[PDB]
């Protein structure tokens, strides 16, 4: 499982309101967060299926 899946979600500095998904390894579920638009970290997906495919693995 990529280690970036353990990171908290990161809004970043921009001011857009974009809903993105991240994998919550504590909750063991994909959740949503508000992404401001720039400087994304790796735990940031455009759909829940992308997050689960990437972070739900072994």
Curated annotation (Swiss-Prot):
Localized where?
Answer: Secreted
DNA damage in keyword set: no
Q: Give start and end of each BPTI/Kunitz inhibitor domain.
A: 5-55
Q: Which GO terms describe its molecular function?
A: calcium ion binding; molecular function inhibitor activity; potassium channel inhibitor activity; protease binding; serine-type endopeptidase inhibitor activity; sulfate binding; zymogen binding
Q: Where is this site: Reactive bond for trypsin?
A: 15-16
Query: Any idea what job this protein has?
Result: Inhibits trypsin, kallikrein, chymotrypsin, and plasmin.
Which keywords does this chain's UniProt record carry?
Disulfide bond, Pharmaceutical, Protease inhibitor, Secreted, Serine protease inhibitor, Signal
Q: What is this protein called?
A: Pancreatic trypsin inhibitor
Lineage: superkingdom: Eukaryota
**Entry's Gene Ontology BP terms:** negative regulation of platelet aggregation; negative regulation of serine-type endopeptidase activity; negative regulation of thrombin-activated receptor signaling pathway; trypsinogen activation
Q: Does the keyword Lipid metabolism apply?
A: no
Q: Which residues cross the membrane?
A: none
Q: What are the cysteine partners in each disulfide bond?
A: 5-55, 14-38, 30-51
* Residues represented out of the complete protein: 36 to 93 of 100
The scientific name of the source species is: Bos taurus
Tell me which GO cellular component terms the UniProt record holds. Answer: extracellular space; serine protease inhibitor complex
